[PDB]
Amino acid sequence: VKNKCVNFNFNGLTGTGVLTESNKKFLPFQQFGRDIADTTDAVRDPQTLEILDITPCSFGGVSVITPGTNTSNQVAVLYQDVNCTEV
Amino acid sequence: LIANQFNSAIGKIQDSLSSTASALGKLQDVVNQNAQALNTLVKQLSSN
């Protein structure tokens, strides 16, 4: 399953992320890609030799906007650094 | 005369900034230390 927040383990690798198709071209021997921080970002699907990106599932801080409760109880919520779809 | 001395003087500032970044060292330094500090932060994750 692709383009969806799914917990996955490839070849028993494990992890949670969003599986997307990748334009990056692995060399034939390689199986696992890694990032600058040596964090797994790309994998080669075992059954079908397809190169999948790992994008970590979205997350961010939740900030609450409020005027003083002395004035009112209405409140507005700020979801940080997320597009207005994941909510 | 002073106008010409002032106008040319601004002109050189462009050229010194255009070619050499040694002037901007101080701001670039702040970026490196902070950016470099995070690299140490994430690096510690891989440590046993």
Partner: peptide, 22 residues
């Protein structure tokens, strides 16, 4: 001239570069 996913979040500055130039 002047030039990740582990809980490290970079907040945006309050005065955007457009406003500061104003």
């Amino acid at each position: 001239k002047v030039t990740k996913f582990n809980g490290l979040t970079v907040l945006p500055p309050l005065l955007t570069d457009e406003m500061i130039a104003q």
